[PDB]
DNA sequence: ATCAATATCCACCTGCAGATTCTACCAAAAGTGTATTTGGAAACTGCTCCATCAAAAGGCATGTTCAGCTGAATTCAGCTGAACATGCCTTTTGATGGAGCAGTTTCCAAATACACTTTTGGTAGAATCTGCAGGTGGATATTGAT
DNA sequence: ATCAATATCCACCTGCAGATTCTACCAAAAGTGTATTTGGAAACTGCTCCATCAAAAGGCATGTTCAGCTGAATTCAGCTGAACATGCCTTTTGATGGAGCAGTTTCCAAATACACTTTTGGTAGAATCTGCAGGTGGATATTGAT
């Protein structure tokens, strides 16, 4: 026999390829599933996770914090044009809002 | 006897509540409300505490977005005070109502 | 019983991009929702493409078109890169 | 057959 | 045994709470008619989300509304919520 | 034995068999119950009936005997429940409901 | 080769309004309509089956779907014609 | 020489176009625009006539709904004239921005 | 070709929308919005056309595109 | 409000071409009869998670007072945008031809679905660490009164 | 232009609730060996799409005049913000009983998988109709003038 190397390792991904493949079969998106689809998709989910985590870690750093809380995920999402579009209709529990005061309200 | 001019504390608050994330409705009252409504739909229901908290996050996030839109409608009307007129125009444009 | 999640993997990625940073259970919950929401969007959209073209099988080509439709702009470009580079790397064993 | 809100019935 | 009858709890959503929600929403000045408006709008929102949630609960032949039931409801209404499973 | 179309045994006009096929072909679940295409065909027939009734009425009011898209639009938007169900749909050639805001009016 | 719902729409139109006819564009609208509603009901039912780790879409799922998707009276009559179609079919 | 007061014909037009369903943009211009746009995405395309008509119905219906909302936003500000300002507020409330 | 969407055309559309009086700045604004609409819908359409390995944009490509954008259109296929 | 005097619509009537409706037939679905799996319902029951309750306390909600200043009403004029008449051209439309393609078949190698059979990676708790939330206090800015 | 009265900011502190680390079973990948499709890769239709061609007609762009509306400016009443006294009820923390999930088995009634057998639904000609598109002529609306 040969030793096992996880499909995640062979695509050089962190995200579980086997697991994404299974979830693809089980959800009845199609009769059959190509061998590369769970690989590609996991690659995408990992990329996007990576991006959210980069920006959110930044926001944790800026607010003196070393542990990411939902607020940092929120600042990270709402301050980036594209993440905010992608998650335009999503609520992040404990997110708060971006501090923003309409100009006209400010003293004159 | 010192006294901030009307509006000054309002702004103090906007900055305050905009900097935090804690829920702004009291938990127990709210829980009580959700059970009432639910009960009128189906009797003898039980709620995971999670469910209730989900409802509150959902609800508070909704109202807050709605006040943001409402606020823009007050501004649009060259006012600084939000009125029912404004909530109505927000809910109508969003498509929430006929 | 066993509850599957993506915490293992999110945490791996968190260590790659921010080694000195950790993450709260609440935040991880937010991230796990995130991976599941996007998974379903991509997969669903892809499923529609397979059906539109009377094909019975979802290949990495469907995942890709799906991505181009679902994700915006730069996020799409970089996504398609990471993807294609995973499939090519994987194919050559 | 089927009853509509208006009261009418299908064939 | 059984619990005290629930009645008029929308009034639990007090005027100060509604004002905090507005402050987070960036509102400076508030018409006195706003509080009842808000309670109305809040009430319709909860009714719709809960109606769906409870519908999922009933479909599962269960007596407990779960966080997932709520989350599915939110999703149906296009108010997708992150952080509670799903 | 002789053939009885499932639609006929279900007392419907809408095609039960076909709906069952679309249910399998559509990858909605691994398996499809025997009554589900019956129920579904029933609902589809019902909704169709309701729409055709009201649009037909609208055809009569605009004194036409042939329903065109306009009559469907009038029928959908003048009925509260159909209008909510079809709130985010565009009926080609539908036009709009005539409506002028009071404030715009003369005098 | 290209199938549609024109036949059945037309039959129902005759049940409801024997004296009324329908233009081709309009038939197209109605055909779109039937596929739009079919897909909504079917999809929601699909989600229902999966949430409950069930492998099969039964009339129970269609019904729950309908209660979620249709508003008010439309729901009530839908569920009515639904269950009574399943009953009549169940008999013979 | 007789002359309608400003607003009378505007209203008369409103009652007119709300009563019909024909497309309101001249076809060829729109077709030309659509092909232009498409060229930025992929070269040497061909369009079903149906496809272009689909785009036109979709597009006119959209703009008309947008004007309904814009008009409400004009009314809200104690105005009767719609301005870019109103379209912008409409599109921001809709979530288009 | 966008200036092809003329001022009388836009004025008719606003008229169907119930509009009485119209600022002159509206027309470029509208052409702008129209242009963005068309960009999003056609971009998705062409994505459908390319995935199908086709060279012709079909009504169905357009319709799926619209549905995606939450602009469901009836009358050009299901 | 009437009296005329432009223009706008609206009904009644009518003929007819483009669609609609209807016929006449055939492949592709749909229905049958049998033979297999298969799910998910029934019946226990193990056990988290929920409903209640108690008690103490201080965080917060209410109600009241009072006056700043915001909303609304009025006034008014400058100028933007509507209505109209004119005149030029881009749009319509109506074939006509031709050819670029989407749509069909018919094979095959490649790619995927199975059916078993070992081998880990992931998960569920306990065993350990450690951010950081609240709590202070001094310095700094901000705000409103004189 | 200054000075009290507050609020904000920010560094340090400390115990702890909530992460992080560490282990042990076990469901889920992974690896192999046959069994099936699947969807191109080529080989060809018919067909919608594009490209001219070529008039005429309304539809669009210009330019003029001014109605009325939008924007600005002022005033003032009265509403909503700020602050305080009062005291209620939400919040916290733990305890218990028990309801109802959820995990495991056991097993028919229900659904899938073939292989035929029939009937319907779709296509493309054949056989009809409903508006449309026009034409006056009859009320209707709009606007200016007494
Ligand atoms: Cl693949
Ligand atoms: Cl109001
Ligand atoms: Cl069933
Ligand atoms: Cl503007
Ligand atoms: Mn009650
Ligand atoms: Mn089983
Ligand atoms: Mn702190
Ligand atoms: Mn037949
Ligand atoms: Mn006519």
PDB file of N, CA, C and O (backbone and C1' of nucleotides) in Angstrom, chain B residues 2-10 12-13 19 26-29 32 46 48 78 81, chain K residues 4-9 71-72 80-84 89-91 97 99-102:
ATOM      1  N   UNK B   2     -24.961  73.723  36.039  1.00  0.00           N
ATOM      2  CA  UNK B   2     -24.454  73.687  34.672  1.00  0.00           C
ATOM      3  C   UNK B   2     -25.447  72.969  33.774  1.00  0.00           C
ATOM      4  O   UNK B   2     -26.241  72.163  34.249  1.00  0.00           O
ATOM      5  N   UNK B   3     -25.409  73.260  32.478  1.00  0.00           N
ATOM      6  CA  UNK B   3     -26.454  72.784  31.596  1.00  0.00           C
ATOM      7  C   UNK B   3     -26.008  72.776  30.128  1.00  0.00           C
ATOM      8  O   UNK B   3     -25.778  73.836  29.544  1.00  0.00           O
ATOM      9  N   UNK B   4     -25.947  71.582  29.531  1.00  0.00           N
ATOM     10  CA  UNK B   4     -25.563  71.430  28.129  1.00  0.00           C
ATOM     11  C   UNK B   4     -26.691  71.892  27.228  1.00  0.00           C
ATOM     12  O   UNK B   4     -27.865  71.704  27.541  1.00  0.00           O
ATOM     13  N   UNK B   5     -26.339  72.515  26.112  1.00  0.00           N
ATOM     14  CA  UNK B   5     -27.349  73.065  25.222  1.00  0.00           C
ATOM     15  C   UNK B   5     -28.049  71.908  24.519  1.00  0.00           C
ATOM     16  O   UNK B   5     -27.406  70.876  24.256  1.00  0.00           O
ATOM     17  N   UNK B   6     -29.360  72.046  24.232  1.00  0.00           N
ATOM     18  CA  UNK B   6     -30.086  70.961  23.570  1.00  0.00           C
ATOM     19  C   UNK B   6     -29.413  70.511  22.294  1.00  0.00           C
ATOM     20  O   UNK B   6     -29.133  71.315  21.396  1.00  0.00           O
ATOM     21  N   UNK B   7     -29.149  69.210  22.235  1.00  0.00           N
ATOM     22  CA  UNK B   7     -28.494  68.609  21.095  1.00  0.00           C
ATOM     23  C   UNK B   7     -27.129  68.076  21.453  1.00  0.00           C
ATOM     24  O   UNK B   7     -26.700  67.068  20.892  1.00  0.00           O
ATOM     25  N   UNK B   8     -26.460  68.729  22.404  1.00  0.00           N
ATOM     26  CA  UNK B   8     -25.084  68.386  22.777  1.00  0.00           C
ATOM     27  C   UNK B   8     -24.985  66.987  23.373  1.00  0.00           C
ATOM     28  O   UNK B   8     -24.088  66.192  23.037  1.00  0.00           O
ATOM     29  N   UNK B   9     -25.919  66.669  24.248  1.00  0.00           N
ATOM     30  CA  UNK B   9     -25.917  65.344  24.824  1.00  0.00           C
ATOM     31  C   UNK B   9     -26.369  64.318  23.787  1.00  0.00           C
ATOM     32  O   UNK B   9     -25.889  63.187  23.801  1.00  0.00           O
ATOM     33  N   UNK B  10     -27.267  64.718  22.886  1.00  0.00           N
ATOM     34  CA  UNK B  10     -27.719  63.807  21.835  1.00  0.00           C
ATOM     35  C   UNK B  10     -26.515  63.292  21.093  1.00  0.00           C
ATOM     36  O   UNK B  10     -26.340  62.064  20.916  1.00  0.00           O
ATOM     37  N   UNK B  12     -23.461  63.403  22.183  1.00  0.00           N
ATOM     38  CA  UNK B  12     -22.637  62.617  23.088  1.00  0.00           C
ATOM     39  C   UNK B  12     -23.051  61.164  23.000  1.00  0.00           C
ATOM     40  O   UNK B  12     -22.227  60.250  22.953  1.00  0.00           O
ATOM     41  N   UNK B  13     -24.355  60.962  22.942  1.00  0.00           N
ATOM     42  CA  UNK B  13     -24.923  59.627  22.899  1.00  0.00           C
ATOM     43  C   UNK B  13     -24.682  58.923  21.584  1.00  0.00           C
ATOM     44  O   UNK B  13     -24.295  57.754  21.568  1.00  0.00           O
ATOM     45  N   UNK B  19     -20.174  53.563  19.496  1.00  0.00           N
ATOM     46  CA  UNK B  19     -18.849  52.983  19.697  1.00  0.00           C
ATOM     47  C   UNK B  19     -18.978  51.594  20.306  1.00  0.00           C
ATOM     48  O   UNK B  19     -18.042  50.803  20.276  1.00  0.00           O
ATOM     49  N   UNK B  26     -33.892  45.913  26.966  1.00  0.00           N
ATOM     50  CA  UNK B  26     -33.655  45.072  28.128  1.00  0.00           C
ATOM     51  C   UNK B  26     -34.067  43.652  27.820  1.00  0.00           C
ATOM     52  O   UNK B  26     -34.952  43.414  26.996  1.00  0.00           O
ATOM     53  N   UNK B  27     -33.308  42.705  28.351  1.00  0.00           N
ATOM     54  CA  UNK B  27     -33.448  41.342  27.892  1.00  0.00           C
ATOM     55  C   UNK B  27     -34.795  40.825  28.306  1.00  0.00           C
ATOM     56  O   UNK B  27     -35.572  40.403  27.456  1.00  0.00           O
ATOM     57  N   UNK B  28     -35.083  40.877  29.606  1.00  0.00           N
ATOM     58  CA  UNK B  28     -36.318  40.281  30.105  1.00  0.00           C
ATOM     59  C   UNK B  28     -37.588  40.809  29.408  1.00  0.00           C
ATOM     60  O   UNK B  28     -38.296  39.985  28.813  1.00  0.00           O
ATOM     61  N   UNK B  29     -37.829  42.149  29.405  1.00  0.00           N
ATOM     62  CA  UNK B  29     -38.959  42.678  28.642  1.00  0.00           C
ATOM     63  C   UNK B  29     -39.076  42.084  27.268  1.00  0.00           C
ATOM     64  O   UNK B  29     -40.163  41.646  26.866  1.00  0.00           O
ATOM     65  N   UNK B  32     -40.095  38.464  27.111  1.00  0.00           N
ATOM     66  CA  UNK B  32     -41.496  38.420  27.468  1.00  0.00           C
ATOM     67  C   UNK B  32     -42.322  38.715  26.216  1.00  0.00           C
ATOM     68  O   UNK B  32     -43.270  37.998  25.884  1.00  0.00           O
ATOM     69  N   UNK B  46     -41.601  26.316  23.692  1.00  0.00           N
ATOM     70  CA  UNK B  46     -40.466  26.696  24.520  1.00  0.00           C
ATOM     71  C   UNK B  46     -39.395  27.253  23.624  1.00  0.00           C
ATOM     72  O   UNK B  46     -39.386  26.965  22.426  1.00  0.00           O
ATOM     73  N   UNK B  48     -35.237  28.090  23.081  1.00  0.00           N
ATOM     74  CA  UNK B  48     -33.829  28.051  23.451  1.00  0.00           C
ATOM     75  C   UNK B  48     -33.420  29.485  23.752  1.00  0.00           C
ATOM     76  O   UNK B  48     -33.844  30.393  23.033  1.00  0.00           O
ATOM     77  N   UNK B  78     -34.953  68.652   4.938  1.00  0.00           N
ATOM     78  CA  UNK B  78     -34.396  69.840   5.555  1.00  0.00           C
ATOM     79  C   UNK B  78     -34.790  69.936   7.030  1.00  0.00           C
ATOM     80  O   UNK B  78     -34.845  71.014   7.589  1.00  0.00           O
ATOM     81  N   UNK B  81     -35.059  66.456  12.917  1.00  0.00           N
ATOM     82  CA  UNK B  81     -35.920  65.645  13.770  1.00  0.00           C
ATOM     83  C   UNK B  81     -36.605  64.550  12.953  1.00  0.00           C
ATOM     84  O   UNK B  81     -37.261  64.838  11.951  1.00  0.00           O
TER      85      UNK B  81
ATOM     86  P    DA K   4     -12.178  79.851  37.825  1.00  0.00           P
ATOM     87  O5'  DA K   4     -13.671  79.398  38.072  1.00  0.00           O
ATOM     88  C5'  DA K   4     -13.944  78.140  38.579  1.00  0.00           C
ATOM     89  C4'  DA K   4     -15.367  77.786  38.255  1.00  0.00           C
ATOM     90  C3'  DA K   4     -15.778  76.393  38.655  1.00  0.00           C
ATOM     91  O3'  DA K   4     -17.183  76.378  38.858  1.00  0.00           O
ATOM     92  C1'  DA K   4     -15.649  76.560  36.291  1.00  0.00           C
ATOM     93  P    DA K   5     -17.852  75.203  39.717  1.00  0.00           P
ATOM     94  O5'  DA K   5     -18.472  74.243  38.617  1.00  0.00           O
ATOM     95  C5'  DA K   5     -19.046  74.792  37.456  1.00  0.00           C
ATOM     96  C4'  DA K   5     -19.535  73.690  36.549  1.00  0.00           C
ATOM     97  C3'  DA K   5     -19.592  72.310  37.212  1.00  0.00           C
ATOM     98  O3'  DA K   5     -20.747  71.581  36.733  1.00  0.00           O
ATOM     99  C1'  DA K   5     -18.053  72.267  35.407  1.00  0.00           C
ATOM    100  P    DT K   6     -21.171  70.155  37.354  1.00  0.00           P
ATOM    101  O5'  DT K   6     -20.998  69.139  36.155  1.00  0.00           O
ATOM    102  C5'  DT K   6     -19.760  68.944  35.599  1.00  0.00           C
ATOM    103  C4'  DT K   6     -19.901  68.459  34.186  1.00  0.00           C
ATOM    104  C3'  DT K   6     -19.697  66.961  34.028  1.00  0.00           C
ATOM    105  O3'  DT K   6     -20.562  66.427  33.049  1.00  0.00           O
ATOM    106  C1'  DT K   6     -17.941  68.129  32.929  1.00  0.00           C
ATOM    107  P    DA K   7     -20.730  64.834  32.915  1.00  0.00           P
ATOM    108  O5'  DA K   7     -19.751  64.529  31.701  1.00  0.00           O
ATOM    109  C5'  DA K   7     -19.770  65.433  30.626  1.00  0.00           C
ATOM    110  C4'  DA K   7     -18.844  65.013  29.521  1.00  0.00           C
ATOM    111  C3'  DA K   7     -18.643  63.515  29.397  1.00  0.00           C
ATOM    112  O3'  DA K   7     -18.509  63.162  28.027  1.00  0.00           O
ATOM    113  C1'  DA K   7     -16.578  64.555  29.944  1.00  0.00           C
ATOM    114  P    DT K   8     -18.270  61.632  27.610  1.00  0.00           P
ATOM    115  O5'  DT K   8     -16.730  61.666  27.215  1.00  0.00           O
ATOM    116  C5'  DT K   8     -16.177  62.896  26.779  1.00  0.00           C
ATOM    117  C4'  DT K   8     -14.785  62.706  26.211  1.00  0.00           C
ATOM    118  C3'  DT K   8     -14.392  61.250  25.968  1.00  0.00           C
ATOM    119  O3'  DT K   8     -13.603  61.143  24.760  1.00  0.00           O
ATOM    120  C1'  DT K   8     -12.963  62.229  27.623  1.00  0.00           C
ATOM    121  P    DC K   9     -13.054  59.722  24.232  1.00  0.00           P
ATOM    122  O5'  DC K   9     -11.548  59.776  24.726  1.00  0.00           O
ATOM    123  C5'  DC K   9     -10.978  61.045  24.982  1.00  0.00           C
ATOM    124  C4'  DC K   9      -9.512  60.933  25.279  1.00  0.00           C
ATOM    125  C3'  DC K   9      -8.952  59.544  25.056  1.00  0.00           C
ATOM    126  O3'  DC K   9      -7.615  59.643  24.649  1.00  0.00           O
ATOM    127  C1'  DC K   9      -8.804  60.078  27.359  1.00  0.00           C
ATOM    128  P    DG K  71     -34.934  74.178  -4.272  1.00  0.00           P
ATOM    129  O5'  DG K  71     -34.402  75.543  -3.656  1.00  0.00           O
ATOM    130  C5'  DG K  71     -34.180  76.633  -4.520  1.00  0.00           C
ATOM    131  C4'  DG K  71     -33.665  77.831  -3.763  1.00  0.00           C
ATOM    132  C3'  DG K  71     -33.035  77.514  -2.415  1.00  0.00           C
ATOM    133  O3'  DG K  71     -31.942  78.416  -2.202  1.00  0.00           O
ATOM    134  C1'  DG K  71     -35.032  78.810  -2.121  1.00  0.00           C
ATOM    135  P    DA K  72     -31.103  78.451  -0.831  1.00  0.00           P
ATOM    136  O5'  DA K  72     -31.551  79.840  -0.208  1.00  0.00           O
ATOM    137  C5'  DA K  72     -31.723  80.946  -1.080  1.00  0.00           C
ATOM    138  C4'  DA K  72     -32.232  82.137  -0.318  1.00  0.00           C
ATOM    139  C3'  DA K  72     -31.714  82.221   1.112  1.00  0.00           C
ATOM    140  O3'  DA K  72     -31.324  83.570   1.382  1.00  0.00           O
ATOM    141  C1'  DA K  72     -34.092  82.219   1.092  1.00  0.00           C
ATOM    142  P    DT K  80     -42.055  66.818  19.418  1.00  0.00           P
ATOM    143  O5'  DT K  80     -40.553  66.386  19.713  1.00  0.00           O
ATOM    144  C5'  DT K  80     -39.550  67.200  19.271  1.00  0.00           C
ATOM    145  C4'  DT K  80     -38.499  67.437  20.330  1.00  0.00           C
ATOM    146  C3'  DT K  80     -38.073  66.237  21.175  1.00  0.00           C
ATOM    147  O3'  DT K  80     -36.683  66.300  21.209  1.00  0.00           O
ATOM    148  C1'  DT K  80     -38.592  68.033  22.576  1.00  0.00           C
ATOM    149  P    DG K  81     -35.750  65.129  21.768  1.00  0.00           P
ATOM    150  O5'  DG K  81     -34.662  65.940  22.585  1.00  0.00           O
ATOM    151  C5'  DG K  81     -34.132  67.133  22.019  1.00  0.00           C
ATOM    152  C4'  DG K  81     -33.198  67.810  22.998  1.00  0.00           C
ATOM    153  C3'  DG K  81     -32.327  66.860  23.788  1.00  0.00           C
ATOM    154  O3'  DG K  81     -31.134  67.509  24.168  1.00  0.00           O
ATOM    155  C1'  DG K  81     -33.834  67.927  25.229  1.00  0.00           C
ATOM    156  P    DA K  82     -29.941  66.671  24.829  1.00  0.00           P
ATOM    157  O5'  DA K  82     -29.848  67.255  26.304  1.00  0.00           O
ATOM    158  C5'  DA K  82     -29.906  68.624  26.499  1.00  0.00           C
ATOM    159  C4'  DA K  82     -30.034  68.972  27.966  1.00  0.00           C
ATOM    160  C3'  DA K  82     -29.285  68.053  28.922  1.00  0.00           C
ATOM    161  O3'  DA K  82     -28.728  68.817  29.940  1.00  0.00           O
ATOM    162  C1'  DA K  82     -31.580  68.103  29.507  1.00  0.00           C
ATOM    163  P    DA K  83     -27.704  68.154  30.977  1.00  0.00           P
ATOM    164  O5'  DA K  83     -28.470  68.148  32.358  1.00  0.00           O
ATOM    165  C5'  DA K  83     -29.468  69.098  32.564  1.00  0.00           C
ATOM    166  C4'  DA K  83     -30.060  68.981  33.944  1.00  0.00           C
ATOM    167  C3'  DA K  83     -29.346  68.011  34.867  1.00  0.00           C
ATOM    168  O3'  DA K  83     -29.441  68.506  36.195  1.00  0.00           O
ATOM    169  C1'  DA K  83     -31.528  67.226  34.426  1.00  0.00           C
ATOM    170  P    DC K  84     -28.770  67.745  37.444  1.00  0.00           P
ATOM    171  O5'  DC K  84     -29.956  67.796  38.500  1.00  0.00           O
ATOM    172  C5'  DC K  84     -31.254  67.924  38.004  1.00  0.00           C
ATOM    173  C4'  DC K  84     -32.275  67.624  39.057  1.00  0.00           C
ATOM    174  C3'  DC K  84     -31.821  66.635  40.112  1.00  0.00           C
ATOM    175  O3'  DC K  84     -32.588  66.819  41.294  1.00  0.00           O
ATOM    176  C1'  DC K  84     -33.464  65.626  38.783  1.00  0.00           C
ATOM    177  P    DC K  89     -42.703  47.886  38.469  1.00  0.00           P
ATOM    178  O5'  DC K  89     -41.565  47.078  37.694  1.00  0.00           O
ATOM    179  C5'  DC K  89     -40.710  47.730  36.805  1.00  0.00           C
ATOM    180  C4'  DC K  89     -39.460  46.906  36.563  1.00  0.00           C
ATOM    181  C3'  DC K  89     -39.652  45.384  36.555  1.00  0.00           C
ATOM    182  O3'  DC K  89     -38.699  44.803  35.682  1.00  0.00           O
ATOM    183  C1'  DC K  89     -38.139  45.933  38.228  1.00  0.00           C
ATOM    184  P    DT K  90     -39.085  44.341  34.192  1.00  0.00           P
ATOM    185  O5'  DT K  90     -37.674  44.261  33.452  1.00  0.00           O
ATOM    186  C5'  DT K  90     -36.904  45.428  33.305  1.00  0.00           C
ATOM    187  C4'  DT K  90     -35.453  45.194  33.693  1.00  0.00           C
ATOM    188  C3'  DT K  90     -34.818  43.896  33.187  1.00  0.00           C
ATOM    189  O3'  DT K  90     -33.518  44.142  32.780  1.00  0.00           O
ATOM    190  C1'  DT K  90     -34.567  44.071  35.511  1.00  0.00           C
ATOM    191  P    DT K  91     -32.679  43.022  31.997  1.00  0.00           P
ATOM    192  O5'  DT K  91     -31.401  42.810  32.909  1.00  0.00           O
ATOM    193  C5'  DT K  91     -30.990  43.824  33.760  1.00  0.00           C
ATOM    194  C4'  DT K  91     -29.922  43.319  34.695  1.00  0.00           C
ATOM    195  C3'  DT K  91     -29.294  42.009  34.258  1.00  0.00           C
ATOM    196  O3'  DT K  91     -27.940  42.030  34.585  1.00  0.00           O
ATOM    197  C1'  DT K  91     -30.301  41.731  36.380  1.00  0.00           C
ATOM    198  P    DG K  97     -35.450  18.170  42.994  1.00  0.00           P
ATOM    199  O5'  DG K  97     -36.628  18.317  41.926  1.00  0.00           O
ATOM    200  C5'  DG K  97     -37.427  19.514  41.896  1.00  0.00           C
ATOM    201  C4'  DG K  97     -38.510  19.395  40.847  1.00  0.00           C
ATOM    202  C3'  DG K  97     -38.791  17.980  40.386  1.00  0.00           C
ATOM    203  O3'  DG K  97     -40.135  17.869  40.000  1.00  0.00           O
ATOM    204  C1'  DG K  97     -37.750  19.204  38.624  1.00  0.00           C
ATOM    205  P    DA K  99     -42.915  16.916  33.119  1.00  0.00           P
ATOM    206  O5'  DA K  99     -43.009  17.571  31.664  1.00  0.00           O
ATOM    207  C5'  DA K  99     -42.735  18.958  31.519  1.00  0.00           C
ATOM    208  C4'  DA K  99     -41.967  19.224  30.246  1.00  0.00           C
ATOM    209  C3'  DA K  99     -42.302  18.336  29.065  1.00  0.00           C
ATOM    210  O3'  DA K  99     -42.026  19.056  27.900  1.00  0.00           O
ATOM    211  C1'  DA K  99     -40.069  18.018  29.598  1.00  0.00           C
ATOM    212  P    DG K 100     -42.993  19.040  26.626  1.00  0.00           P
ATOM    213  O5'  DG K 100     -41.917  19.041  25.451  1.00  0.00           O
ATOM    214  C5'  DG K 100     -40.713  19.781  25.637  1.00  0.00           C
ATOM    215  C4'  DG K 100     -39.496  19.053  25.093  1.00  0.00           C
ATOM    216  C3'  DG K 100     -39.787  18.182  23.887  1.00  0.00           C
ATOM    217  O3'  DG K 100     -38.753  18.246  23.061  1.00  0.00           O
ATOM    218  C1'  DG K 100     -38.784  16.871  25.528  1.00  0.00           C
ATOM    219  P    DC K 101     -38.869  19.183  21.783  1.00  0.00           P
ATOM    220  O5'  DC K 101     -37.382  19.337  21.416  1.00  0.00           O
ATOM    221  C5'  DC K 101     -36.801  18.201  21.060  1.00  0.00           C
ATOM    222  C4'  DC K 101     -35.372  18.178  21.443  1.00  0.00           C
ATOM    223  C3'  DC K 101     -34.538  17.473  20.424  1.00  0.00           C
ATOM    224  O3'  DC K 101     -33.232  17.875  20.558  1.00  0.00           O
ATOM    225  C1'  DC K 101     -34.726  16.132  22.343  1.00  0.00           C
ATOM    226  P    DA K 102     -32.347  18.136  19.256  1.00  0.00           P
ATOM    227  O5'  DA K 102     -31.210  17.036  19.483  1.00  0.00           O
ATOM    228  C5'  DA K 102     -31.082  16.502  20.795  1.00  0.00           C
ATOM    229  C4'  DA K 102     -30.660  15.047  20.807  1.00  0.00           C
ATOM    230  C3'  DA K 102     -30.316  14.424  19.454  1.00  0.00           C
ATOM    231  O3'  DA K 102     -29.139  13.656  19.645  1.00  0.00           O
ATOM    232  C1'  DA K 102     -31.956  13.113  20.524  1.00  0.00           C
TER     233       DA K 102
END
